[PDB]
Design a protein around this ligand. Structure first.
Ligand code: QZJ
Ligand code: QZJ
Lengths: 298, 297
C-alpha cells in the first residue's frame, strides 16, 4: 500500500516574487528582494582571479553604490553593507510583494524548501534536510548562488538558507540570513572537508511511525529503550541525540506505540532488516520529519 | 559522491494564482480559474450519501448557476456545463493573472508537477510520474480534489491533470482537461481493476546514464542488446517498450556509452546488482527522466 509519504515542497509563489539578479562586474548571481533590501552572497564582489584568498573587507570598501546592478525579471542601489557572508543592499523601491517573513536559522534534521534560480529566474523547487554535518543535498549548478531556502508557518515565511557553495562530495552549503555560513565553511574557493554525517534520530522515529500508520509494524516489540539510554548509545553509533516534540507526541498518541519502543527498534534495525522492508525500503530513512508525517498521513 | 539528482518541481507561482474553492451545496473542493472559466471535478455535485453510483447527468440538470459558489482565497457563476468528468463553470470576472497555457495529455513515464490544494489554498507541491497503469503516487488527502498537475515548455504551462480519486492500494488518478480520466477509471466510489505497474525502460536508461556521469559505470560492458530484442524481452518481464529520444541521445553523447549497452545492462541488473550499488541503490530506479538527467547533471 502506497503511504502517500513523499518529498513535498512549499508553494514557491511568495518567494518567486522576491528573486532578483545581482551583478557586480563580471560576476552575476541571485538576490532576495525584501522591502527596500536585497540580500546576496558577498562573493559577487570577487573577480575569479582572487577567489582563493579574497579580502572582503577591502573589496567592500572599494565599491560604490554604482558597483551593484540589480535586475528584476520574474532597481537603483542607494546603500551597501556587509553582514557576515552576505551583502545587504538598499534599493530605492520597496518590493510590492514582500511576504511576511522572519530570519531564523535552522538546526540539523529540519527540512526546508529550496527555490533554485539562475540569473534571477526561478527554475525549480525541491526540499532538503539540513544534515548534522551542516550540508544539504539537492541540485545546484553554476549560477545558482543566491538561491534561497525557506519554510512557511501560517502566513509567515521563514527564510533560512542562501546558497553559496558545493563541496567535493557533491553536497552543498550556504548562509543563514544573519550572515553565518552553515557549518565551518568559508566562502573561499578552497578545498573544504565536511565532518562525518549522522542519522537524524527524530526523523527515523517519525518515519517508523509513518510505517505503523500505513499498516507496517512487524518491527514493533514490547521492548523499550529510554531516551537517555538511546542518546548515550547514539553518540557512539552515528545517530543524533533524540529530542522529542509535540509533533512526535501526536504520532505516539495516534498509534499507541511509545517513542521508547521505536528507539529500541532503531537499535535493532540499524544494521539491516534481514529480508524485510519498511515503506518500500531496506534501510532506515531519516529525511522525513515528524511534521511531514503528521501533515501527509493524517 | 552525491549526484545532485533529486525530485524537482516547477515553480508553482503561476498556477497558485489560478486556484479557487468551489462549493456546491454541501461539497467543496478546488478549481482552476483560467480567464472566465473555472474547472473542477463534477463530483462536487454529489452529496456524500450517494457517491457510489451518482447520476451525473441528472445532477447537472438539477443544478442552476446559483447552485455553485466560487471563492478565491490565494466570484459569481453565470454558466455551467459538463465536459467528461469535469465541470466548466463560467464566472463573471476574468482571471487577470491567467498564464499562457495549453492542455496536454501526458503519457506513461512522463513527469509532471502537482500543486496540492485544500479549500482553494495551495499547501504543497511535488513531482510524480504517470505510471504505466495510468495512476500516480503523490500525496492526496480528503479535500484535495481539484488539485492540478502541469508541465512547462518555456513560460507556457501545460495543464495535464486534475485530481479525482484514490484507489484501494493508495495510488491516485485524475482527469485530463479534455474531461477523460487517465486509464479509463470511473469517477465513482467503487472498487475498480488496476493493472500492474511496469518499469519505464526509458527512465531506467536515463538513470543509468546519470550513474555513468556521476562516475559509477561498473555495470557498463561492451555487450549490447538491440531495441527490438530488448522490447521483446521487456514484455515478459514487466518493462515498458523503450522508445529512443533526442534527450536520451544527448546522454549517450555526453558519456560515450551507447543506448544498447545499457539495455543489455538492464537485463542483467534486473536480476540484482550482485553485491554492488548504483547511485546508492540496489534496485533499478525509473522515475527520473532523460530530461531530468540532462537538466540536473
Ligand atoms: C555559486 O553559484 C556557486 C555554486 C556551485 C557551482 C557549482 N555547483 C554549485 O553549487 N558557488 C561557488 O562556486 C563557490 C564560490 C566560493 C567563493 C564559495 N565555490 C564552489 O562551490 O566551488 C566548488 C565547485 C565544485 C567543485 C566540485 C567538488 C568544488 C568547489
Ligand atoms: C476528492 O478530494 C477525493 C480525494 C480522495 C479522498 C481521499 N484521498 C483522495 O485522494 N476523492 C474522492 O473522495 C473520491 C470521490 C469519487 C466520487 C470519485 N472517492 C474516493 O477516492 O474513494 C476512495 C477513497 C479511499 C478508498 C480506500 C479503500 C477507496 C475509494
Amino acid at each position: 500500500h502506497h503511504s502517500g509519504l513523499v518529498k513535498m515542497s512549499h508553494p514557491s509563489g511568495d518567494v518567486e516574487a522576491c528573486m532578483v539578479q545581482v551583478t557586480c562586474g563580471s560576476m552575476t548571481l541571485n538576490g532576495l528582494w525584501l522591502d527596500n533590501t536585497v540580500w546576496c552572497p558577498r562573493h559577487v564582489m570577487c573577480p575569479a582571479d582572487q577567489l582563493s584568498d579574497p579580502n572582503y573587507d577591502a573589496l567592500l570598501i572599494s565599491m560604490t553604490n554604482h558597483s551593484f546592478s540589480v535586475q528584476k525579471h520574474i532597481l537603483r542601489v542607494v546603500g551597501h553593507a556587509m553582514q557576515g557572508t552576505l551583502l545587504k543592499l538598499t534599493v530605492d523601491v520597496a518590493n510590492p510583494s514582500t511576504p511576511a517573513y522572519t530570519f531564523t536559522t535552522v538546526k540539523p534534521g529540519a527540512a526546508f524548501s529550496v527555490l533554485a534560480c539562475y540569473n534571477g529566474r526561478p527554475t525549480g523547487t525541491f526540499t532538503v534536510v539540513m544534515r548534522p554535518n551542516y550540508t544539504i543535498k539537492g541540485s545546484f549548478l553554476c549560477g545558482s548562488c543566491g538561491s534561497v531556502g525557506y519554510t512557511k508557518e501560517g502566513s509567515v515565511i521563514n527564510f533560512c538558507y542562501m546558497h553559496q557553495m558545493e563541496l567535493a562530495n557533491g553536497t552543498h552549503t550556504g548562509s543563514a540570513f544573519d550572515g553565518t555560513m552553515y557549518g565551518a565553511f568559508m566562502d573561499k574557493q578552497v578545498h573544504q572537508v565536511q565532518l562525518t554525517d549522522k542519522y537524524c534520530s527524530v526523523n527515523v522515529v517519525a518515519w517508523l511511525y509513518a510505517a505503523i500508520l500505513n499498516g507496517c509494524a512487524w518491527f514493533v516489540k514490547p521492548n523499550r529503550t529510554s531516551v537517555v539510554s538511546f542518546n548515550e548509545w547514539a553518540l557512539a553509533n552515528q545517530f543524533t541525540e533524540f529530542v522529542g516534540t509535540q509533533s512526535v507526541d501526536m504520532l505516539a498518541v495516534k498509534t499507541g506505540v511509545a517513542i521508547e519502543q521505536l528507539l529500541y527498534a532503531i537499535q535493532q534495525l540499524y544494521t539491516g532488516f534481514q529480508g524485510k522492508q519498511i515503506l518500500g525500503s531496506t534501510m532506515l530513512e531519516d529525511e522525513f520529519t515528524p511534521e511531514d508525517v503528521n501533515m501527509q498521513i493524517m
